[PDB]
Point group: C3
Chain length 336, copies 3
C-alpha cells in the first residue's frame, strides 16, 4: 500500500489489559485492514518474585512482566506509541519479532528517559510473536529484566486446524515465562539493590552461568495461582498463548492436553495435535488450544519439573463443571 | 460410554515386562474396546547407576527405572492397580499424561505405604505418553528418583505414516532416559545415604543447578550394552519408544536414522522423516521407526555428546546381516600418506 | 545399482570453500548420479576465539571451524579423501549423519597421523546433515574442539515448498555453531596448554558442567560481524544452513524471518513457515530460506540472548536496497 492508502485506513485505539488477560478483540477480522493503535509507558520498578522477598529490577512495558498481549489481524498495521518517562534511568526500545526491518523496530525506537516514539509496522505474518527491548550492547540484560511480551496476529478468518476447519476459543490467556538471574551473597541469600544499574555486573555473572535462579510465569513464583488462577468450565475452549523471550520452555497442562498446538507460534504452520508437552524455543511464542473435559484444578507448567516446582514455573487453572467417569474414575479409592 | 456399557466390556489382564522390552501386544487392535488391566507395586530401592557403584535411592514403578511400558489401543480403558507396600516410607501416586482429569490421575491415586488404589481411564488419544509419580510438594524429587515410565496407545488400526500407508514394526524397544542428580562430597566423590530421606536436601541443591550428574538409559550408565545391547538384523523394522519425564533429549541412532519419527510422540501428528537427530522435550515420549540396512554395532544416544559419552546416555544395537557396499564402502582403508 | 553401474558413474572432483561460503554447485542436479569427490586435510592448531586472546586447541577439518559444507544431490555418492598429516598428534575419523553403516563412517576412517583414508557413501536422503569426528572413547572432546561441519544433500530437482513450488536461492551461507569449554584457573583466567592432550582433563571437567564458556559462529566471537558480516540485497533469496553437532540452538534473523524453515534439516519433512525463531537440536543441521524485504544491518543469533550477546553467538547481515515504509515506518522519531 501507498502512504496515501495507509492514511485512508480506519484507525482503532486499543486499551491494553494486564496479563494473563488479553484486551478485547475479534477472532474473525471486523472489516478491512486497519491501523491498530497501542500506547505503552515503560516502568522501571522493583518486583518481588518469590515468598522470600527476592527482588528484581524489572524493566516493564505497561508496568507488567510480561508486557501485555497486543492483538491485531494479518495485514493490519500495528502502531505503537512507546513512552520512556523521565522517572526512568535507562534507554529502552522495542523489537517486534512480527515486524520486518530495523531489527524488528529497535533501530527506530531508541528512547532515553523523557522521550517517546511512534512506530508503525505491517503485520504481514499470522501467529504469536515475541516482542522485547534490545538496546545495543545491553540486549539480554533488558530481556531478562522482564522487558518482553508478545503479540498475536490472527488470520483475518480467525483460527483453523490443519485441515481448514474453524477453531473458535471462548477464552484466551497469555502466559509470559521469565527466566531471572538473581545474585546471591556468600551465605546464598539473594542480594537487593537500590538502583537497576547497581545490579548489572552481579546479574551478568549469574546470566553467564546460563542457570536461572527463578523461572516464573507473570513475573513471580505463584503469580498465576490462587487469586490469579486461570479459569474455565467443562466444555469451554481456551487458547493459551505462551512466550519465552530468552530461554526454552516445555509447556504442559497437567490433567489436560494441547488439543491443537502451534508450537512454532505460526498459524500458517499446521498445528500439532493431542499434545502432552509442547516445546517453545527461547525467543519465540507458541499457542495451544484446549477444550476442557473435566472439572477441577489443573497445573500448567514448564515440564522440566525442577523448573516448575523448585524454580517457580507453575500456574493453575480452576475448572468448574461435572465430573466425567467415562474418561476417568477411581475404581478403588486409596485404601489398606 | 455409560457405567453399564463399560462394565459389559471384555477385560484383559496383562503381565508387564521389564524395559527395554515390551509386553506382548497386537499392533492392530483385536476386537472392540476392552478394559486392559495392569498391576504395579512401587519399590523404594537402592540401585547402582554406574560402574563405580554410585547409588541412588530409586522410587521404582514395578521395581524398574524406567517403569514398564503399558500398551493399549485408542478407546480401550487402562485399568491400573497401583500398590504402595508397607515396606516403603513415602506416599506415592501416578500421573498419566495420556489421561484426562485429576492431574492425569494423581489426585485420585495418592497412596500411603500399606495402601493400594485402582485407577481407570479411557485412552482417548493415540501416541506414546509419559507417566510419573507427582506427590504435591515433592514432585520433581520423585521423578528424578526414577519414578516414571511411559505408555503406548496404538491407533486401533495400528501405525501408519503421515500419508495413510501402514507401518508395521518387527520389534519394539522402550528406552527410558533418566536424569540423576547425585550429591558429591568435598573430594567430588558421589555420596551414599542410609535412608532416601537423608539424601533429600543435598539432592535438591544439585537439582537446582539443572545439571544432571548422570543421564542414563534403563537406569544406569551402559545398561543397554554388552549382553544387554538391543538387537536387530538388516531389513528388520524397529520401533524405538523414548521417554524423558523431566528433561529434554535429542535421540540419534549413530550409523542409522529415524525413518519416521513422531517427535511429539502423538500418532495423529504426522511423523518427521529421514531424521538424523530428533528432539523430545522433558515431560514427553517420542517414537522412531527405522529399518536397518547395515550390520554391525550402532550407538543410540542423546546427541548432546557430553550427555551421551560422559554422563551415560548411550545404548548399543548389535545388528546381524550382510554389509552393503553400495550404501557405504572403504575405497581406501587407513594407510600411510 | 549393479556393480558395473556404480563403477560406470562419473567421478567429479570439487574444490572446497571455507565457511560461511559454499563451493560451486547447481540446485537442480546436473545429469544423473555422480560420485562427488572431496579432499580434506585435518589441521590441529591453536586458534584464538575471543577479544581476550583465549585459545583453543582446534581440531579442524580442512583447517576451519566449522569444517566446510559439502554439497551433493540425492543418490549421488560422496567420496571423501581424509588426510591426517604426520605433524598432528591425535587419531581422527569422520562420521556423516547423512551416511548409513559403520557409525556414519567413523568405523572405516580411523586415521593416525601420517595416514589417509577414502570413504564413499550413497547420499540416500535429502537434507542438511551434521558430520563430525568421533574417535571411540573421545567423541565429544573432538567435536567440542571444533571437529565438525555439515553437508547438504539437495533433492535432484532442487528445493520446494510444502506445495511443491520451487524455492531457488540466490545465495547460500553455512553458519556452524560451536560450543567451546575453555578451562579457567582459580582467578577466572582462561588457561593455555602446550599440546591438545594437556588440556584434556581440565576440558572434560568444564564439559561435564554442560555450560559452554563460548558459543560462537565460524569459530570465534564476532567472526561473522563487521567487515565479515554476510551480505544480501532487498529481493534476494538466501538459504542459511545452520549446524550444531553437540548442543541445541535456536536461530533467529533479527529484523527478518525464516520464510521456510526445514527445522529438522530434512527436505522430505515439509518446512515450517513464517518462523520467528527455529530450533535445531544438538547433533543436527537445519536450513532457513528468507527473501530480504528491507535494507540495513540484521543480527542473526542463537536466541538465547545470553548465548548470543554474552557468549558470542551473534552474526550480522549487511543488506543493500530501498527502504519499504509500508512494512515499517517511524511515525514519530525518538523525541522529548
Ligand atoms: Cu528477539
Ligand atoms: Cu507430568
Ligand atoms: Cu553424531
Ligand atoms: Cu529496555
Ligand atoms: Cu513417588
Ligand atoms: Cu578428531
Amino acid at each position: 500500500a501507498t502512504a496515501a492508502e495507509i492514511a485512508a485506513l480506519p484507525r482503532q485505539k486499543v486499551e491494553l489489559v494486564d496479563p494473563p488477560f488479553v484486551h478485547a478483540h475479534s477472532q474473525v477480522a471486523e472489516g478491512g485492514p486497519k491501523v491498530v493503535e497501542f500506547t505503552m509507558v515503560i516502568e522501571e520498578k522493583k518486583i518481588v518474585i518469590d515468598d522470600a522477598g527476592t527482588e528484581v529490577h524489572a524493566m516493564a512495558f505497561n508496568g507488567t512482566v510480561p508486557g501485555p498481549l497486543m492483538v491485531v489481524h494479518q495485514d493490519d498495521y500495528l502502531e505503537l506509541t512507546l513512552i520512556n518517562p523521565e522517572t526512568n534511568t535507562l534507554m529502552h526500545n522495542i523489537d517486534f519479532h512480527a515486524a520486518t526491518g530495523a531489527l524488528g523496530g529497535g533501530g527506530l525506537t531508541e528512547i532515553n528517559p523523557g522521550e517517546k516514539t511512534i512506530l508503525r509496522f505491517k503485520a504481514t505474518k499470522p501467529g504469536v510473536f515475541v516482542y522485547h527491548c534490545a538496546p545495543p550492547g545491553m540486549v539480554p540484560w533488558h530481556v531478562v529484566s522482564g522487558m518482553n511480551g508478545a503479540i498475536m496476529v490472527l488470520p483475518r478468518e480467525g483460527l483453523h486446524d490443519g485441515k481448514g476447519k474453524a477453531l473458535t476459543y471462548d477464552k484466551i490467556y497469555y502466559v509470559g515465562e521469565q527466566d531471572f538471574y538473581v545474585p546471591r551473597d556468600e551465605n546464598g541469600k539473594y542480594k537487593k539493590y537500590e538502583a537497576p544499574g547497581d545490579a548489572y555486573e552481579d546479574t551478568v555473572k549469574v546470566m553467564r552461568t546460563l542457570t536461572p535462579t527463578h523461572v516464573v510465569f507473570n513475573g513471580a513464583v505463584g503469580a498465576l495461582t490462587g487469586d490469579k488462577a486461570m479459569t474455565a468450565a467443562v466444555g469451554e475452549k481456551v487458547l493459551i498463548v505462551h512466550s519465552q523471550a530468552n530461554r526454552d520452555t516445555r509447556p504442559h497442562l497437567i490433567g489436560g492436553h494441547g488439543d491443537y498446538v502451534w508450537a512454532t507460534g505460526k498459524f500458517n504452520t499446521p498445528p500439532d495435535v493431542d499434545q502432552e508437552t509442547w516445546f517453545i524455543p527461547g525467543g519465540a511464542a507458541g499457542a495451544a488450544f484446549y477444550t476442557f473435559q473435566q472439572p477441577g484444578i489443573y497445573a500448567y507448567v514448564n515440564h522440566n519439573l525442577i523448573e516448575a516446582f523448585e524454580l517457580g514455573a507453575a500456574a493453575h487453572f480452576k475448572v468448574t463443571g461435572e465430573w466425567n467417569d467415562d474418561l476417568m474414575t477411581s475404581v478403588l479409592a486409596p485404601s489398606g
